[PDB]
Amino acid sequence: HTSDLYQEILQVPGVSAIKKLSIANYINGLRQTQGHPWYLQLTDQYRPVL
Amino acid sequence: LVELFEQEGNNRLALKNLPDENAFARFLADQTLVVVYELQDQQRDSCLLDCDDTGKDRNFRLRYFLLPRSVPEKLSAEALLQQGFSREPLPQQWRDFSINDIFQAQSSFFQNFF
Amino acid sequence: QRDHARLGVAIASDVLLLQEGRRVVEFKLSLGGFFPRLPDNQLHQAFVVYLSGEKAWIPAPILPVGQLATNGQEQTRWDGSNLYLVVELAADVAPILPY
């Protein structure tokens, strides 16, 4: 859920406001989807990293 | 409002699953259809694999609603007619008619007044 | 195991001032909606009627489906969705007075 990242990006000193935020899934270096502003579904066999 | 659809969905119950034919008949009683033509502006976003951004695309679609004929405190066909047609002051002799009465007085003319 | 609740209708009108003689009354109810019909041969057993008196209420039985009123044509029956209920009072029944 993107709000879990929104609320932590808003905690860094110097950040005033978040005008845009979205996330996307990559496996093997290739983009798997188009992305979504509010939530993303993960693959069964894989752990998320940054 | 009660919405109708051609396809199933998450909150879209099938009419086939109504308890009985009389339940269907009571469901379709004293109600009208309206077809609404709705406009919207979709925002372009290059982060969403669009070719560009900083712009909007206007697009429209159709929606079907099942509306009550007459309900004193909610949206009903009579309320829509009142809103649409009763915008200007009418001649004095018509002031006491509802919109559907002011329409029916002209077809039921010859049954009376002959 | 408790008592039954009360459910019904009351009709107030001035045609009901009936004080003497043999009296015949006919109610006609025009109904709507979607509902099952009660079987004919038990109609006269579905309802009870009370009329207003001087000190009490007066009970009045309903005429069954296969017979006509005395010296007349009124009859208890179904007519599509109209319901007819007929009541006869004899000459020894008390007057029907205002409430």
mmCIF file of C-alpha atoms in Angstrom:
data_model
loop_
_atom_site.group_PDB
_atom_site.id
_atom_site.type_symbol
_atom_site.label_atom_id
_atom_site.label_comp_id
_atom_site.label_asym_id
_atom_site.label_seq_id
_atom_site.Cartn_x
_atom_site.Cartn_y
_atom_site.Cartn_z
ATOM 1 C CA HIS A 1 0.000 0.000 0.000
ATOM 2 C CA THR A 2 1.466 3.318 -1.097
ATOM 3 C CA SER A 3 0.303 5.175 2.019
ATOM 4 C CA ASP A 4 2.834 3.185 4.060
ATOM 5 C CA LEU A 5 5.561 4.813 1.956
ATOM 6 C CA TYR A 6 3.791 8.212 1.871
ATOM 7 C CA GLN A 7 3.778 8.444 5.686
ATOM 8 C CA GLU A 8 7.487 7.564 5.937
ATOM 9 C CA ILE A 9 8.692 9.836 3.140
ATOM 10 C CA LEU A 10 6.833 12.615 4.953
ATOM 11 C CA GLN A 11 9.095 12.041 7.989
ATOM 12 C CA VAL A 12 12.411 13.127 6.419
ATOM 13 C CA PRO A 13 13.617 16.628 7.390
ATOM 14 C CA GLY A 14 13.445 18.965 4.418
ATOM 15 C CA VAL A 15 10.474 17.290 2.713
ATOM 16 C CA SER A 16 7.556 19.715 2.457
ATOM 17 C CA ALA A 17 4.877 17.863 0.478
ATOM 18 C CA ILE A 18 4.489 14.886 -1.852
ATOM 19 C CA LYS A 19 3.016 15.915 -5.190
ATOM 20 C CA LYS A 20 3.262 12.511 -6.887
ATOM 21 C CA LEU A 21 3.947 8.915 -5.831
ATOM 22 C CA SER A 22 3.571 5.521 -7.518
ATOM 23 C CA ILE A 23 5.212 2.086 -7.439
ATOM 24 C CA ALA A 24 5.992 -0.696 -9.912
ATOM 25 C CA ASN A 25 7.144 -4.323 -9.869
ATOM 26 C CA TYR A 26 10.436 -5.527 -11.396
ATOM 27 C CA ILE A 27 11.642 -9.130 -11.757
ATOM 28 C CA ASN A 28 14.903 -10.086 -13.513
ATOM 29 C CA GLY A 29 15.447 -6.431 -14.389
ATOM 30 C CA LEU A 30 12.336 -6.294 -16.595
ATOM 31 C CA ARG A 31 9.187 -4.333 -15.779
ATOM 32 C CA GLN A 32 6.356 -6.742 -15.206
ATOM 33 C CA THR A 33 3.468 -4.224 -15.108
ATOM 34 C CA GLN A 34 2.321 -0.654 -15.685
ATOM 35 C CA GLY A 35 2.073 0.279 -12.027
ATOM 36 C CA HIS A 36 -0.617 1.665 -9.779
ATOM 37 C CA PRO A 37 -1.012 4.728 -7.530
ATOM 38 C CA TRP A 38 -2.510 3.028 -4.458
ATOM 39 C CA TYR A 39 -1.605 -0.672 -4.170
ATOM 40 C CA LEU A 40 0.429 -3.437 -5.796
ATOM 41 C CA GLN A 41 0.136 -7.236 -5.694
ATOM 42 C CA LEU A 42 3.236 -9.374 -5.114
ATOM 43 C CA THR A 43 4.276 -12.694 -6.638
ATOM 44 C CA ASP A 44 3.943 -15.801 -4.462
ATOM 45 C CA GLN A 45 7.592 -16.895 -4.534
ATOM 46 C CA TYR A 46 9.413 -13.580 -4.110
ATOM 47 C CA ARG A 47 10.403 -11.181 -1.286
ATOM 48 C CA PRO A 48 10.151 -7.416 -1.925
ATOM 49 C CA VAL A 49 13.306 -5.283 -1.874
ATOM 50 C CA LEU A 50 14.107 -1.719 -2.914
ATOM 51 C CA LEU B 1 -29.946 4.716 -6.598
ATOM 52 C CA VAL B 2 -30.272 1.121 -7.762
ATOM 53 C CA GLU B 3 -27.967 0.470 -10.706
ATOM 54 C CA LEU B 4 -28.392 -2.189 -13.384
ATOM 55 C CA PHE B 5 -25.618 -3.894 -15.340
ATOM 56 C CA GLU B 6 -25.127 -6.319 -18.216
ATOM 57 C CA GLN B 7 -22.304 -8.245 -16.511
ATOM 58 C CA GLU B 8 -21.527 -9.651 -13.084
ATOM 59 C CA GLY B 9 -19.158 -7.998 -10.643
ATOM 60 C CA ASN B 10 -18.005 -7.763 -7.060
ATOM 61 C CA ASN B 11 -21.171 -6.104 -5.721
ATOM 62 C CA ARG B 12 -23.363 -6.945 -8.725
ATOM 63 C CA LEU B 13 -26.042 -9.472 -7.781
ATOM 64 C CA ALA B 14 -27.731 -11.473 -10.521
ATOM 65 C CA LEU B 15 -31.475 -11.057 -10.966
ATOM 66 C CA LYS B 16 -31.660 -14.810 -11.581
ATOM 67 C CA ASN B 17 -31.169 -15.306 -7.827
ATOM 68 C CA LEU B 18 -34.306 -13.454 -6.730
ATOM 69 C CA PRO B 19 -36.409 -15.614 -4.373
ATOM 70 C CA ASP B 20 -39.479 -15.959 -6.596
ATOM 71 C CA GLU B 21 -41.312 -14.425 -9.542
ATOM 72 C CA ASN B 22 -43.426 -12.324 -7.184
ATOM 73 C CA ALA B 23 -40.211 -10.960 -5.680
ATOM 74 C CA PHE B 24 -39.158 -9.903 -9.178
ATOM 75 C CA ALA B 25 -42.558 -8.325 -9.812
ATOM 76 C CA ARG B 26 -42.451 -6.360 -6.554
ATOM 77 C CA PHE B 27 -38.898 -5.341 -7.452
ATOM 78 C CA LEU B 28 -40.085 -3.962 -10.821
ATOM 79 C CA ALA B 29 -43.069 -2.002 -9.565
ATOM 80 C CA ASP B 30 -43.792 1.715 -9.870
ATOM 81 C CA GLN B 31 -40.315 2.466 -11.239
ATOM 82 C CA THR B 32 -38.796 3.932 -14.411
ATOM 83 C CA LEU B 33 -35.512 3.670 -16.300
ATOM 84 C CA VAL B 34 -33.124 6.525 -17.024
ATOM 85 C CA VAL B 35 -30.065 6.444 -19.290
ATOM 86 C CA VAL B 36 -27.398 8.949 -18.230
ATOM 87 C CA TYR B 37 -24.598 10.195 -20.499
ATOM 88 C CA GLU B 38 -21.603 10.982 -18.288
ATOM 89 C CA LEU B 39 -18.444 12.930 -19.110
ATOM 90 C CA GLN B 40 -15.057 12.702 -17.381
ATOM 91 C CA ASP B 41 -11.463 13.880 -17.859
ATOM 92 C CA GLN B 42 -8.735 11.240 -17.572
ATOM 93 C CA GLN B 43 -5.367 12.632 -16.502
ATOM 94 C CA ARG B 44 -2.303 11.767 -18.569
ATOM 95 C CA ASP B 45 0.710 10.539 -16.597
ATOM 96 C CA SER B 46 4.038 9.580 -18.155
ATOM 97 C CA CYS B 47 4.806 7.550 -15.018
ATOM 98 C CA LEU B 48 1.951 5.228 -16.075
ATOM 99 C CA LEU B 49 3.552 4.341 -19.446
ATOM 100 C CA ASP B 50 1.872 7.221 -21.288
ATOM 101 C CA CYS B 51 3.715 8.799 -24.201
ATOM 102 C CA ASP B 52 3.528 12.201 -22.484
ATOM 103 C CA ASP B 53 1.829 14.022 -19.613
ATOM 104 C CA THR B 54 0.546 17.484 -18.619
ATOM 105 C CA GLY B 55 -2.833 17.055 -20.257
ATOM 106 C CA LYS B 56 -6.252 15.486 -19.995
ATOM 107 C CA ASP B 57 -8.405 13.375 -22.311
ATOM 108 C CA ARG B 58 -12.159 13.948 -22.293
ATOM 109 C CA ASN B 59 -14.229 10.770 -22.515
ATOM 110 C CA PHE B 60 -17.819 9.763 -21.862
ATOM 111 C CA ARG B 61 -19.863 6.668 -21.098
ATOM 112 C CA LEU B 62 -23.420 5.516 -20.385
ATOM 113 C CA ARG B 63 -25.034 4.439 -17.119
ATOM 114 C CA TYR B 64 -28.442 2.917 -16.374
ATOM 115 C CA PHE B 65 -30.466 3.808 -13.291
ATOM 116 C CA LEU B 66 -33.764 2.518 -11.926
ATOM 117 C CA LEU B 67 -35.632 5.482 -10.495
ATOM 118 C CA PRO B 68 -38.781 5.596 -8.339
ATOM 119 C CA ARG B 69 -41.774 7.279 -9.935
ATOM 120 C CA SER B 70 -42.850 9.318 -6.904
ATOM 121 C CA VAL B 71 -41.156 9.532 -3.500
ATOM 122 C CA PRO B 72 -41.688 12.668 -1.372
ATOM 123 C CA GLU B 73 -38.128 13.065 -0.049
ATOM 124 C CA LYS B 74 -35.870 11.365 -2.627
ATOM 125 C CA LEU B 75 -35.072 11.696 -6.309
ATOM 126 C CA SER B 76 -38.018 10.597 -8.428
ATOM 127 C CA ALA B 77 -39.252 11.113 -11.974
ATOM 128 C CA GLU B 78 -41.717 13.765 -10.820
ATOM 129 C CA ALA B 79 -38.879 15.656 -9.131
ATOM 130 C CA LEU B 80 -36.787 15.607 -12.307
ATOM 131 C CA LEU B 81 -39.707 16.868 -14.392
ATOM 132 C CA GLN B 82 -40.315 19.655 -11.870
ATOM 133 C CA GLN B 83 -36.651 20.660 -11.959
ATOM 134 C CA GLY B 84 -36.382 20.597 -15.742
ATOM 135 C CA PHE B 85 -39.608 22.222 -16.894
ATOM 136 C CA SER B 86 -40.720 24.475 -14.005
ATOM 137 C CA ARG B 87 -37.930 27.006 -14.538
ATOM 138 C CA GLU B 88 -40.086 29.968 -15.603
ATOM 139 C CA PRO B 89 -43.335 31.382 -14.205
ATOM 140 C CA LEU B 90 -46.323 29.814 -15.936
ATOM 141 C CA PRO B 91 -49.585 31.580 -16.806
ATOM 142 C CA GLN B 92 -51.852 32.147 -13.831
ATOM 143 C CA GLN B 93 -54.398 29.511 -14.842
ATOM 144 C CA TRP B 94 -51.810 26.699 -14.806
ATOM 145 C CA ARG B 95 -50.239 27.459 -11.416
ATOM 146 C CA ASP B 96 -52.068 24.624 -9.639
ATOM 147 C CA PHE B 97 -50.942 21.744 -11.884
ATOM 148 C CA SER B 98 -48.055 19.352 -11.561
ATOM 149 C CA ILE B 99 -45.994 18.779 -14.685
ATOM 150 C CA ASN B 100 -47.563 15.443 -15.533
ATOM 151 C CA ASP B 101 -51.009 16.873 -14.826
ATOM 152 C CA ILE B 102 -50.276 19.823 -17.103
ATOM 153 C CA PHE B 103 -49.291 17.227 -19.704
ATOM 154 C CA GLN B 104 -52.229 14.847 -19.275
ATOM 155 C CA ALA B 105 -54.819 17.635 -19.355
ATOM 156 C CA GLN B 106 -54.221 17.859 -23.111
ATOM 157 C CA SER B 107 -54.710 14.194 -24.049
ATOM 158 C CA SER B 108 -57.669 13.574 -21.742
ATOM 159 C CA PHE B 109 -59.285 16.649 -23.300
ATOM 160 C CA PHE B 110 -61.797 14.928 -25.553
ATOM 161 C CA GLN B 111 -63.043 12.403 -23.019
ATOM 162 C CA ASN B 112 -64.369 15.482 -21.266
ATOM 163 C CA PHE B 113 -65.523 18.740 -22.838
ATOM 164 C CA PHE B 114 -67.478 17.213 -25.726
ATOM 165 C CA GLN C 1 -47.475 -19.693 24.347
ATOM 166 C CA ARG C 2 -48.441 -16.026 24.750
ATOM 167 C CA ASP C 3 -51.528 -14.220 23.479
ATOM 168 C CA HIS C 4 -51.987 -13.162 19.871
ATOM 169 C CA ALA C 5 -51.382 -9.556 18.866
ATOM 170 C CA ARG C 6 -54.085 -7.273 17.473
ATOM 171 C CA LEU C 7 -54.039 -6.352 13.779
ATOM 172 C CA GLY C 8 -56.806 -4.686 11.816
ATOM 173 C CA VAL C 9 -58.603 -1.691 10.360
ATOM 174 C CA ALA C 10 -61.238 0.717 11.656
ATOM 175 C CA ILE C 11 -63.712 2.571 9.428
ATOM 176 C CA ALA C 12 -65.515 5.691 10.666
ATOM 177 C CA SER C 13 -68.455 6.912 8.592
ATOM 178 C CA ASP C 14 -71.949 8.331 8.949
ATOM 179 C CA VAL C 15 -73.746 5.716 6.827
ATOM 180 C CA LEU C 16 -73.489 3.343 9.802
ATOM 181 C CA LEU C 17 -76.214 4.917 11.966
ATOM 182 C CA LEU C 18 -78.503 1.874 12.084
ATOM 183 C CA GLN C 19 -81.044 1.701 14.890
ATOM 184 C CA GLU C 20 -83.945 -0.611 14.033
ATOM 185 C CA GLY C 21 -85.248 -3.327 11.753
ATOM 186 C CA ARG C 22 -83.450 -5.923 9.701
ATOM 187 C CA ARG C 23 -80.218 -4.397 8.429
ATOM 188 C CA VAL C 24 -77.884 -5.521 5.660
ATOM 189 C CA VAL C 25 -74.352 -4.121 5.318
ATOM 190 C CA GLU C 26 -71.857 -4.649 2.494
ATOM 191 C CA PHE C 27 -68.189 -3.624 2.522
ATOM 192 C CA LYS C 28 -66.215 -3.553 -0.732
ATOM 193 C CA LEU C 29 -62.413 -3.338 -0.557
ATOM 194 C CA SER C 30 -60.401 -2.594 -3.704
ATOM 195 C CA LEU C 31 -56.896 -3.970 -3.161
ATOM 196 C CA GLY C 32 -53.563 -3.942 -4.962
ATOM 197 C CA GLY C 33 -50.103 -5.494 -4.934
ATOM 198 C CA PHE C 34 -48.875 -9.058 -5.329
ATOM 199 C CA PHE C 35 -50.056 -11.606 -2.764
ATOM 200 C CA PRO C 36 -51.771 -15.009 -2.593
ATOM 201 C CA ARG C 37 -55.545 -15.367 -2.429
ATOM 202 C CA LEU C 38 -57.328 -16.936 0.510
ATOM 203 C CA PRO C 39 -59.397 -20.007 -0.452
ATOM 204 C CA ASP C 40 -63.060 -19.174 -0.985
ATOM 205 C CA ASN C 41 -64.708 -21.638 1.380
ATOM 206 C CA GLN C 42 -62.966 -20.093 4.407
ATOM 207 C CA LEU C 43 -63.305 -16.348 3.708
ATOM 208 C CA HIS C 44 -66.091 -15.886 6.258
ATOM 209 C CA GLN C 45 -63.734 -17.338 8.881
ATOM 210 C CA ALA C 46 -60.769 -15.012 8.303
ATOM 211 C CA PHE C 47 -62.278 -11.796 9.709
ATOM 212 C CA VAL C 48 -64.283 -10.617 12.705
ATOM 213 C CA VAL C 49 -66.455 -7.486 12.697
ATOM 214 C CA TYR C 50 -67.426 -5.211 15.590
ATOM 215 C CA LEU C 51 -69.972 -2.386 15.547
ATOM 216 C CA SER C 52 -70.355 0.542 17.928
ATOM 217 C CA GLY C 53 -73.028 0.556 20.613
ATOM 218 C CA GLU C 54 -74.299 2.521 23.610
ATOM 219 C CA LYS C 55 -72.165 0.784 26.249
ATOM 220 C CA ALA C 56 -70.347 -2.025 24.410
ATOM 221 C CA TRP C 57 -69.214 -3.344 21.055
ATOM 222 C CA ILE C 58 -71.545 -5.574 19.045
ATOM 223 C CA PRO C 59 -70.205 -8.632 17.163
ATOM 224 C CA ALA C 60 -71.611 -9.519 13.763
ATOM 225 C CA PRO C 61 -70.964 -12.751 11.819
ATOM 226 C CA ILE C 62 -70.033 -12.738 8.130
ATOM 227 C CA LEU C 63 -72.235 -14.484 5.573
ATOM 228 C CA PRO C 64 -70.640 -17.512 3.848
ATOM 229 C CA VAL C 65 -69.841 -17.639 0.169
ATOM 230 C CA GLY C 66 -72.640 -19.699 -1.319
ATOM 231 C CA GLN C 67 -75.729 -17.821 -0.120
ATOM 232 C CA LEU C 68 -77.395 -14.467 -0.738
ATOM 233 C CA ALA C 69 -78.754 -11.946 1.726
ATOM 234 C CA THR C 70 -82.435 -12.027 2.613
ATOM 235 C CA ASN C 71 -84.537 -10.487 -0.171
ATOM 236 C CA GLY C 72 -81.493 -9.209 -2.018
ATOM 237 C CA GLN C 73 -78.425 -9.914 -4.114
ATOM 238 C CA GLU C 74 -75.469 -9.037 -1.861
ATOM 239 C CA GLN C 75 -72.888 -11.787 -1.422
ATOM 240 C CA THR C 76 -69.441 -12.365 0.093
ATOM 241 C CA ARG C 77 -66.923 -13.119 -2.641
ATOM 242 C CA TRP C 78 -63.791 -12.388 -4.659
ATOM 243 C CA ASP C 79 -64.057 -10.362 -7.879
ATOM 244 C CA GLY C 80 -60.599 -10.272 -9.386
ATOM 245 C CA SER C 81 -58.848 -8.242 -6.695
ATOM 246 C CA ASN C 82 -62.010 -6.777 -5.129
ATOM 247 C CA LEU C 83 -63.244 -8.288 -1.864
ATOM 248 C CA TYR C 84 -66.918 -8.206 -0.834
ATOM 249 C CA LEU C 85 -67.970 -8.893 2.765
ATOM 250 C CA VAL C 86 -71.644 -8.941 3.794
ATOM 251 C CA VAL C 87 -73.212 -8.783 7.275
ATOM 252 C CA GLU C 88 -76.839 -9.228 8.392
ATOM 253 C CA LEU C 89 -78.340 -7.915 11.631
ATOM 254 C CA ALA C 90 -81.721 -9.134 12.861
ATOM 255 C CA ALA C 91 -84.516 -7.106 14.427
ATOM 256 C CA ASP C 92 -83.513 -8.040 18.001
ATOM 257 C CA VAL C 93 -79.946 -6.706 17.729
ATOM 258 C CA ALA C 94 -79.137 -3.474 19.561
ATOM 259 C CA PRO C 95 -78.836 -0.099 17.787
ATOM 260 C CA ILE C 96 -75.586 1.048 16.186
ATOM 261 C CA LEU C 97 -74.794 4.412 17.773
ATOM 262 C CA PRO C 98 -72.033 7.043 17.531
ATOM 263 C CA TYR C 99 -68.659 6.524 19.180
#
